Amino acid sequence: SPYGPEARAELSSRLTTLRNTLAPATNDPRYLQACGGEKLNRFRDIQCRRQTAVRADLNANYIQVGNTRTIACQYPLQSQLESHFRMLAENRTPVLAVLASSSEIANQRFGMPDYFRQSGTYGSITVESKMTQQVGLGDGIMADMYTLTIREAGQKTISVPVVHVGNWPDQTAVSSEVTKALASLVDQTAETKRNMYESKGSSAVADDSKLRPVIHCRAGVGRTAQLIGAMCMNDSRNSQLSVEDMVSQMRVQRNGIMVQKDEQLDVLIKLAEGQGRPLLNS
Ligand SMILES: */C=C/S(=O)(=O)c1ccccc1
């Protein structure tokens, strides 16, 4: 069977070998390295692919699965906020999807700054956070939305649509119904903002490294990967892209953990089967 346990076991096998191969070795050439001793990676073993790094001081990667282009990153460290906001601004971010829970953010032991729900000043950058709408995704999962306006002297003021699922616990997978609802909402939000820039004749439209949806959570390899996978599967241009392709591409473009838990992979499998999308590559 195409979606039978034998097929699932084979997929899991192939991806496991890939994760182990991609594991970062000390001073790994494939991964972005910290500078002068200042922490770059929130987690020592969840690193950032150098070839696709967005900024030299952020754990963040440009990711292209099939035709879907995005940016995946870890929750910025307090010391990276300024550079983080810079990335968001320069990217003309059409949507910022944060899947880190409100509990994680609230726990000061985690060092996850409340940067998109609060207004403040960071270096020479000043940010305002306007709470907008709230959208249920099912099973009680809630999406809180905000408008993040980024201001800096001499720079074009940029406002960013934020989609925050604050009750999706770490290392777990919300149902495929919830995932599809979320991916639809994120893409929809992104399409509205991107359209705005295109109507204004923004030069960012001609730059493939810009206008990308930015997705992340705490480490940016689980809930983040699950959403990205769902998003690429919603792209009407990714016909024939298999789950194997999908997960391997995210892994080679960020790190080998992308799609952290089996439960998260299962959701991607389920969505694939729903569309008749192949799991393995022949
Ligand atoms: C998108 C966050 S996550 O990848 O799910 C994660 C965060 C912290 C620890 C493990 C996974």
Rounded distance between C-alpha atoms, residue 253 and residue 73, angstroms: 11
Residue 214 phi, psi (nearest 5) = -105, 120
Question: What's 61's DSSP letter?
Answer: E
Q: Report helix, strand or coil for 221.
A: coil
Residues 6+ apart with CB under 8 A from 131: 117, 144, 145, 146
Q: Report helix, strand or coil for 31.
A: strand
Please spell the DSSP secondary structure of 69-110, one letter per residue: EEEEEPPPPGGGHHHHHHHHHHTT-S-EEE---HHHHH-GGG
Q: Residue 126 has which token pair?
A: 């000043």
Of 208, 197, 203, whose CA–CA distance to 95 is shortest?
197
Ligand 1 centre to CA of 173 (Å) is 11
Rounded distance between C-alpha atoms, residue 238 and residue 13, angstroms: 24
Please spell the DSSP secondary structure of 102-160, one letter per residue: HHHHH-GGG----TTTS-EEETTEEEEEEEEEEEEEETTEEEEEEEEEEEETTS--EEE
Strands 158-165 and 68-73: unpaired
- Which residues are identified as catalytic? 217
Ligand 1-lining residues (CB < 6 angstroms):
99, 170-171, 217-224, 260
Please give the resolution of this entry in Å, rounded to 1 decimal.
2.0
The CA angle 260-75-58, to the nearest 5 degrees, is 105
Strands 68-73 and 60-65: antiparallel
Instruction: Select from 223, 228, 250, 258 the residue to mutate for testing ligand 1; criterion: most ligand atoms less than 8 Å from CB.
Output: 223
Report the nearest-CA residue for atom 5 of ligand 1.
Answer: 222
Q: Please tell me the total count of domains within the chain.
A: 1
Of 176, 164, 263, 175, whose CA–CA distance to 217 is shortest?
164
Of 139, 212, 211, whose CA–CA distance to 182 is shortest?
139
Helix, strand and coil content of the chain, in percent to the nearest 5, comes to 40, 20, 40
Q: Which atom of ligand 1 is nearest to the CA of 220?
A: 1
Other CB atoms within 10 Å distance of the CB of residue 166:
18
Ligand 1 centre to CA of 143 (Å) is 18
Structural domain boundaries enclosing 124: 1-282
Ligand 1 centre to CA of 273 (Å) is 25
Cβ atoms of residues 115 and 76 within 8 Å: yes
Instruction: Select from 109, 163, 170 the residue to mutate for testing ligand 1; criterion: most ligand atoms less than 8 Å from CB.
Output: 170
Rounded distance between C-alpha atoms, residue 34 and residue 76, angstroms: 14
Q: Which atom of ligand 1 is nearest to the CA of 257?
A: 4
Question: What's 280's DSSP letter?
Answer: S
Q: Which atom of ligand 1 is nearest to the CA of 224?
A: 1
Q: Report helix, strand or coil for 64.
A: strand
Rounded distance between C-alpha atoms, residue 65 and residue 81, angstroms: 27
Q: State the CATH number of the domain containing residue 127.
A: 3.90.190.10
Instruction: Select from 61, 168, 217, 251 the residue to mutate for testing ligand 1; criterion: most ligand atoms less than 8 Å from CB.
Output: 217
| N residues, the chain | 282
Angle between helices 5-22 and 243-253 (to 10 degrees): 10
Rounded distance between C-alpha atoms, residue 166 and residue 160, angstroms: 18
Report the nearest-CA residue for atom 6 of ligand 1.
Answer: 219
Residue corresponding to tokens 């990967």: 225
- Residue 235: burial class (beta carbons within 10 Å; 0-12, 13-18, 19+): middle
